[PDB]
Design an enzyme around this catalytic site. Sequence first.
Site, PDB file in Angstrom:
ATOM      1  N   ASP A   1      28.013 -58.966 111.219  1.00 26.44           N
ATOM      2  CA  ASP A   1      27.863 -58.403 112.566  1.00 26.44           C
ATOM      3  C   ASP A   1      28.571 -57.050 112.645  1.00 26.44           C
ATOM      4  OD1 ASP A   1      27.216 -57.949 115.221  1.00 26.44           O
ATOM      5  OD2 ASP A   1      28.388 -59.604 116.044  1.00 26.44           O
TER       6      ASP A   1
ATOM      7  N   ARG B   1      31.562 -52.152 118.166  1.00 30.61           N
ATOM      8  CA  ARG B   1      32.386 -53.106 118.912  1.00 30.61           C
ATOM      9  C   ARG B   1      33.243 -53.977 117.995  1.00 30.61           C
ATOM     10  NH1 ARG B   1      27.144 -54.600 118.983  1.00 30.61           N
ATOM     11  NH2 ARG B   1      26.831 -56.362 117.546  1.00 30.61           N
ATOM     12  N   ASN B   2      32.888 -54.096 116.720  1.00 26.61           N
ATOM     13  CA  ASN B   2      33.663 -54.914 115.798  1.00 26.61           C
ATOM     14  C   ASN B   2      34.533 -54.076 114.859  1.00 26.61           C
ATOM     15  OD1 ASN B   2      33.019 -57.553 116.629  1.00 26.61           O
ATOM     16  ND2 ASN B   2      31.003 -57.420 115.647  1.00 26.61           N
TER      17      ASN B   2
ATOM     18  N   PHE C   1      34.577 -65.740 122.600  1.00 24.42           N
ATOM     19  CA  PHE C   1      35.315 -66.364 121.504  1.00 24.42           C
ATOM     20  C   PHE C   1      36.737 -66.750 121.892  1.00 24.42           C
ATOM     21  CE2 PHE C   1      32.760 -63.313 118.580  1.00 24.42           C
ATOM     22  CZ  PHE C   1      31.608 -64.063 118.810  1.00 24.42           C
ATOM     23  N   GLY C   2      37.307 -66.100 122.883  1.00 22.65           N
ATOM     24  CA  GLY C   2      38.699 -66.326 123.225  1.00 22.65           C
ATOM     25  C   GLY C   2      39.303 -65.062 123.823  1.00 22.65           C
TER      26      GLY C   2
ATOM     27  N   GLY D   1      36.611 -62.397 125.509  1.00 26.55           N
ATOM     28  CA  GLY D   1      35.185 -62.615 125.400  1.00 26.55           C
ATOM     29  C   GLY D   1      34.888 -64.082 125.206  1.00 26.55           C
TER      30      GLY D   1
ATOM     31  N   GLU E   1      46.220 -57.887 112.340  1.00 24.77           N
ATOM     32  CA  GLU E   1      46.838 -56.568 112.424  1.00 24.77           C
ATOM     33  C   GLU E   1      46.635 -55.951 113.808  1.00 24.77           C
ATOM     34  OE1 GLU E   1      45.418 -54.038 109.308  1.00 24.77           O
ATOM     35  OE2 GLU E   1      46.575 -52.287 109.950  1.00 24.77           O
TER      36      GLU E   1
ATOM     37  N   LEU F   1      44.746 -57.787 125.069  1.00 27.60           N
ATOM     38  CA  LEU F   1      44.041 -56.686 124.438  1.00 27.60           C
ATOM     39  C   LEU F   1      42.527 -56.811 124.498  1.00 27.60           C
ATOM     40  CD1 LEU F   1      46.293 -56.502 121.253  1.00 27.60           C
ATOM     41  CD2 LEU F   1      46.410 -54.976 123.247  1.00 27.60           C
ATOM     42  N   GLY F   2      42.001 -58.019 124.600  1.00 25.12           N
ATOM     43  CA  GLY F   2      40.571 -58.206 124.565  1.00 25.12           C
ATOM     44  C   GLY F   2      40.246 -59.621 124.968  1.00 25.12           C
TER      45      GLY F   2
ATOM     46  N   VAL G   1      42.620 -62.037 123.226  1.00 31.88           N
ATOM     47  CA  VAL G   1      43.477 -61.414 122.218  1.00 31.88           C
ATOM     48  C   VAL G   1      44.697 -60.862 122.929  1.00 31.88           C
ATOM     49  CG1 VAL G   1      43.674 -59.649 120.425  1.00 31.88           C
ATOM     50  CG2 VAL G   1      41.462 -60.865 120.808  1.00 31.88           C
TER      51      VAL G   1
ATOM     52  N   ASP H   1      36.891 -58.753 112.359  1.00 33.27           N
ATOM     53  CA  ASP H   1      36.117 -59.991 112.584  1.00 33.27           C
ATOM     54  C   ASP H   1      35.020 -60.182 111.538  1.00 33.27           C
ATOM     55  OD1 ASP H   1      37.629 -60.832 114.776  1.00 33.27           O
ATOM     56  OD2 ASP H   1      36.177 -60.179 116.272  1.00 33.27           O
TER      57      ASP H   1
ATOM     58  N   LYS I   1      44.827 -63.634 118.198  1.00 35.21           N
ATOM     59  CA  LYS I   1      43.484 -63.963 118.658  1.00 35.21           C
ATOM     60  C   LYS I   1      43.410 -65.474 118.843  1.00 35.21           C
ATOM     61  CE  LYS I   1      40.627 -60.662 117.311  1.00 35.21           C
ATOM     62  NZ  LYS I   1      39.576 -59.878 116.563  1.00 35.21           N
TER      63      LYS I   1
HETATM   64  C1  LIG Z   1      33.091 -61.809 121.712  1.00 35.22           C
HETATM   65  N1  LIG Z   1      34.431 -61.261 121.644  1.00 35.22           N
HETATM   66  C2  LIG Z   1      35.505 -61.968 121.996  1.00 35.22           C
HETATM   67  O1  LIG Z   1      35.425 -63.144 122.370  1.00 35.22           O
HETATM   68  C3  LIG Z   1      36.842 -61.232 121.970  1.00 35.22           C
HETATM   69  C4  LIG Z   1      38.003 -62.162 121.610  1.00 35.22           C
HETATM   70  C5  LIG Z   1      37.929 -62.477 120.149  1.00 35.22           C
HETATM   71  C6  LIG Z   1      37.271 -61.679 119.259  1.00 35.22           C
HETATM   72  N2  LIG Z   1      37.377 -62.218 117.988  1.00 35.22           N
HETATM   73  C7  LIG Z   1      38.105 -63.386 118.064  1.00 35.22           C
HETATM   74  C8  LIG Z   1      38.470 -64.286 117.068  1.00 35.22           C
HETATM   75  C9  LIG Z   1      39.202 -65.388 117.444  1.00 35.22           C
HETATM   76  C10 LIG Z   1      39.575 -65.595 118.766  1.00 35.22           C
HETATM   77  C11 LIG Z   1      39.220 -64.707 119.758  1.00 35.22           C
HETATM   78  C12 LIG Z   1      38.469 -63.579 119.415  1.00 35.22           C
HETATM   79  C13 LIG Z   1      36.557 -60.413 119.628  1.00 35.22           C
HETATM   80  N3  LIG Z   1      36.833 -60.093 121.044  1.00 35.22           N
HETATM   81  C14 LIG Z   1      37.129 -58.866 121.541  1.00 35.22           C
HETATM   82  O2  LIG Z   1      37.437 -58.693 122.724  1.00 35.22           O
HETATM   83  C15 LIG Z   1      37.071 -57.676 120.603  1.00 35.22           C
HETATM   84  C16 LIG Z   1      35.972 -56.720 121.080  1.00 35.22           C
HETATM   85  C17 LIG Z   1      34.610 -57.353 121.186  1.00 35.22           C
HETATM   86  C18 LIG Z   1      33.824 -57.510 120.059  1.00 35.22           C
HETATM   87  C19 LIG Z   1      32.571 -58.082 120.153  1.00 35.22           C
HETATM   88  C20 LIG Z   1      32.099 -58.505 121.379  1.00 35.22           C
HETATM   89  C21 LIG Z   1      32.860 -58.369 122.527  1.00 35.22           C
HETATM   90  C22 LIG Z   1      32.344 -58.842 123.852  1.00 35.22           C
HETATM   91  C23 LIG Z   1      34.119 -57.800 122.411  1.00 35.22           C
HETATM   92  N4  LIG Z   1      38.333 -56.980 120.529  1.00 35.22           N
HETATM   93  C24 LIG Z   1      39.333 -57.430 119.768  1.00 35.22           C
HETATM   94  O3  LIG Z   1      39.212 -58.428 119.060  1.00 35.22           O
HETATM   95  C25 LIG Z   1      40.585 -56.605 119.745  1.00 35.22           C
HETATM   96  C26 LIG Z   1      40.881 -55.651 120.729  1.00 35.22           C
HETATM   97  C27 LIG Z   1      42.023 -54.877 120.676  1.00 35.22           C
HETATM   98  C28 LIG Z   1      42.886 -55.073 119.592  1.00 35.22           C
HETATM   99  N5  LIG Z   1      44.060 -54.478 119.251  1.00 35.22           N
HETATM  100  N6  LIG Z   1      44.548 -54.982 118.079  1.00 35.22           N
HETATM  101  C29 LIG Z   1      43.698 -55.915 117.691  1.00 35.22           C
HETATM  102  C30 LIG Z   1      42.611 -56.026 118.597  1.00 35.22           C
HETATM  103  C31 LIG Z   1      41.453 -56.792 118.677  1.00 35.22           C
END
Ligand SMILES: CNC(=O)[C@H]1Cc2c([nH]c3ccccc23)CN1C(=O)[C@@H](Cc1cccc(C)c1)NC(=O)c1ccc2[nH]ncc2c1
Length: 270
Positions: free
Chosen positions: A133, A137-138, A25-26, A23, A87, A20-21, A28, A151, A42
């Site tokens: 933050d 995007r969050n 951080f990891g 970046g 969720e 799903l995502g 998803v 987040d 995540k």
């Molecule tokens: C730096 N971000 C990251 O690295 C990754 C992985 C990750 C996050 N936050 C984390 C916390 C722990 C481990 C990994 C991560 C947040 N993350 C995402 O892509 C976010 C969107 C996002 C936000 C800020 C910046 C950027 C570049 C992308 N999407 C989602 O989180 C997401 C997208 C679709 C979804 N559908 N349902 C739930 C759900 C959640």
Amino acid sequence: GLGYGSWEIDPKDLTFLKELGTGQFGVVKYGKWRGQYDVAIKMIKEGSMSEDEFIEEAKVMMNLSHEKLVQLYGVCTKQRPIFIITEYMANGCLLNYLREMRHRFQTQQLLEMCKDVCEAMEYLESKQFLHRDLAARNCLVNDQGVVKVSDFGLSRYVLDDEYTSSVGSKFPVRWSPPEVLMYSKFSSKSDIWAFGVLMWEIYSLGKMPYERFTNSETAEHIAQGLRLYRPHLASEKVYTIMYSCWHEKADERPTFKILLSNILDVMDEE
Ligand SMILES: CNC(=O)[C@H]1Cc2c([nH]c3ccccc23)CN1C(=O)[C@@H](Cc1cccc(C)c1)NC(=O)c1ccc2[nH]ncc2c1
Ligand SMILES: [Cl-]
Ligand code: NA
């Protein structure tokens, strides 16, 4: 269990489906828990988080619950890497959702997205919890179109200094008030500023704030008195609300409780 019983989830009860995502951080993944309940898994990229501190705080965050706040169900910490079970939101991050032209949003829908986020942030404020933050995007969007805040508080455990230092290349400069950029003065009022920018993103259908300016230029000019223009889709009354988030003096900015009332007033006129 999932939000019930042990907050340590058994990863053997998880199935790992589509990504799903992704970046720094990891990553998803969409998953099922005991083959019945949808989850977003995540997985924390090793080397990116202060994992001990993050696990300690996850226990407390298990107590945060609100309809417009992305629910934390638990964690998986007995393996490498560790997982956060959260969720599932079928429509993904709000930023991309806003940019999809096929949705052809009405302004009534945009205001409700603002109401959604605001209700979540009034909740956090009542718990003396900062998002730190806040930005499109969050935020996430579920299958019904409801926006929820995601987040929250996570930046406290990010090791990358480019993302936590106000001069870093990854810091949310365009969502930060002058006292953050100048003096590292964080408070509820710096969340309030960010929420104003988030309303601007929503009514701009996902445009980057201050697009014609670099990070450095943005920081310099907002401190001098530059403010984001009114988006074409925002009425004067809607712009008055997001503008109120950007007073130079932090303690002149509203609370989320006051913002919510203002947003309801505008909604109530339809
Ligand atoms: C730096 N971000 C990251 O690295 C990754 C992985 C990750 C996050 N936050 C984390 C916390 C722990 C481990 C990994 C991560 C947040 N993350 C995402 O892509 C976010 C969107 C996002 C936000 C800020 C910046 C950027 C570049 C992308 N999407 C989602 O989180 C997401 C997208 C679709 C979804 N559908 N349902 C739930 C759900 C959640
Ligand atoms: Cl002022
Ligand atoms: Na501009």
